Paper text:
Glutathione S-transferases (GST) are involved in the metabolism of PEITC by catalyzing its conjugation with glutathione (GSH). As phase II detoxification enzymes, cytosolic GSTs exist and function as stable homo- or heterodimers. The dimer is required to maintain the functional conformations at the GSH-binding site and xenobiotic substrate-binding site in each subunit. Here, we report the crystal structures of hGSTP1 and hGSTA1 in complex with GS-PEITC (hGSTP1:GS-PEITC and hGSTA1:GS-PEITC, respectively).
We determined the crystal structures of the hGSTA1:GS-PEITC and hGSTP1:GS-PEITC complexes at 1.93- and 1.95-Å resolution, respectively. The structures show that the orientation of the phenethyl moiety of the conjugate was significantly different in the two GST enzymes. In the hGSTA1:GS-PEITC structure, the phenethyl moiety of GS-PEITC docks into a hydrophobic pocket formed by the side chains of Leu107, Leu108, Val111, Met208, Leu213, Phe222, Phe10 and Phe220. The hGSTA1 contains a single cysteine residue, Cys112. The hGSTA1:GS-PEITC structure reveals that the side chain of Cys112 was covalently modified by PEITC. Like the sulfhydryl group of GSH, the sulfhydryl group of Cys112 acts as a nucleophile and attacks the isothiocynate central C atom of PEITC and forms an irreversible adduct with hGSTA1 (hGSTA1Cys112-PEITC). In the hGSTA1 dimer, the Cys112 pair is located near the entrance of the solvent channel at the subunit interface. One can imagine that the covalent modification of both Cys112 side chains with PEITC must have significant impact on the dynamics of the interface, the openness of the solvent channel, the binding of GSH and substrate, and the release of the product. Indeed, the formation of Cys112-PEITC in hGSTA1 did alter the catalytic activity significantly, leading to more than two orders of magnitude inhibition in vitro.
Numbering used by the authors:
A (entry chain B), B (entry chain A): 2 to 222
Write the structure that this text describes.
């Protein structure tokens, strides 16, 4: 049990940001894929899940649930959480904006069909007018290669992950954000992240209809 | 030196857990209330809001947005975030469960009238069968006065705040969790918290009709 062990169903979902961070940190992990409501109930009954939910990661003797608890620990453990409390505040402020946007995109597929169009348009408007400007502005103001402390952090990893999902959405959205483009390229070419982006890795594909129906079967929603 | 300043409207909303945490830490703070969309637009134009939203807290030379960024910083600063990353992992796991429940309760008032009762019922069920059981188990597990590290942390503060909102919802819900009942009593009698719970503190009341209108008008939803 040297490898962290990720419990989740076979999809990006709430576990993918953790997959990215671990990979960018060069940490190898195992994944135990939930395939059925029965598998989830198994974990639930063996007392593995504090709030009866996944994501859960077995790491360092712990059974960590809650996405942010997992990410925070992993980021600290591998020195990707800034150097002090004030760097951490910037990292936290940045990645919480990223989380807000990411949550909107993550849930788009379960928007009621009569709300789907307006929600997509809202997401595009916020990307254009709120989130991309905010992060371009940060890069522009210190001119450095990384978001915080002139050094690779979880913030660059989380943001670049999001850039890939926005590109899947509408490849034109990032067009007028040169600094964001540059960041995506630099980060994507880091050896650990390059390897994750390449075919064959544990990186997961966009959720399709089949996958969405598996999640409804498993999590009973 | 300079007191923290809390930028929000005059309500609990997303700023109340910050008010609790600062107050519990014995930190005096000031509030600048937003009363109109025009006040919000000023903070925006002034460049004070990274994502054009509040909560915003001015603290130690930073304009901190994002509830979790704010709370994380304050928790670390006043030694309420555990003594090592393993304790922070437990704290994070606990408080993210508290966040999940708090979010359901926070947004209850903006449920459409034909969803209000169903949603309320779900909440009560999750309190009774998922969340209170988890936190009671943690307390029963080590038998100590505080959730983590045998010492006051943000987890105790965030939980007890939540126990007060649950009491407003349905005073019977806590009835079969003696350790939670006793935690609430103990934390409520810490000098700093006791003063916050007394009249005249920055502690805010439950949202009533007018408050909600002020919120729609101000934040344009
Ligand atoms: N705040 C928690 C949330 C955990 C959570 O919601 N877990 C889900 C599983 S996570 C999820 S549903 N993954 C897919 C998300 C998704 C669904 C549909 C379309 C797109 C994405 C779960 O366990 N449900 C069972 C239950 O609560 O009884 C966290 O961040 O870890
Ligand atoms: N993830 C962010 C979210 C901040 C946020 O949503 N702020 C709202 C204001 S906070 C909120 S609306 N508080 C009221 C809570 C409430 C809502 C509905 C019913 C009852 C209470 C805002 O600024 N909206 C304007 C905009 O996005 O353009 C954070 O935690 O800080």
């Amino acid at each position: 049990a040297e490898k962290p062990k990720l419990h989740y169903f076979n999809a990006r979902g709430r576990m993918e940001s953790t997959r990215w961070l671990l990979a960018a940190a060069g940490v190898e992990f195992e994944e135990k894929f939930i395939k059925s409501a029965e598998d989830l109930d198994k974990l639930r009954n063996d007392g593995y899940l504090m709030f009866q939910q996944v994501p859960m990661v077995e790491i360092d003797g712990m059974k960590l649930v809650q996405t942010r608890a997992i990410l925070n620990y992993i980021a600290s453990k591998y020195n990707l959480y800034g150097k002090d409390i004030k760097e951490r505040a910037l990292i936290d402020m940045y990645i919480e904006g990223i989380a807000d946007l990411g949550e909107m995109i993550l849930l788009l597929p379960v928007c009621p069909p009569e709300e789907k169009d307006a929600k997509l348009a809202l997401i595009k408007e916020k990307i254009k007018n709120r989130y991309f400007p905010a992060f371009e502005k940060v890069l522009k103001s210190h001119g450095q290669d990384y978001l915080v402390g002139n050094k690779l952090s979880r913030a660059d990893i989380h943001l670049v992950e999001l850039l890939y999902y926005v590109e899947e959405l509408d490849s034109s959205l990032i067009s007028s954000f040169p600094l964001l483009k540059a960041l995506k390229t630099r980060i994507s070419n880091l050896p650990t992240v390059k390897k994750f982006l390449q075919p064959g890795s544990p990186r997961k594909p966009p959720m399709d209809e089949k996958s969405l129906e598996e999640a409804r079967k498993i999590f009973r929603f």
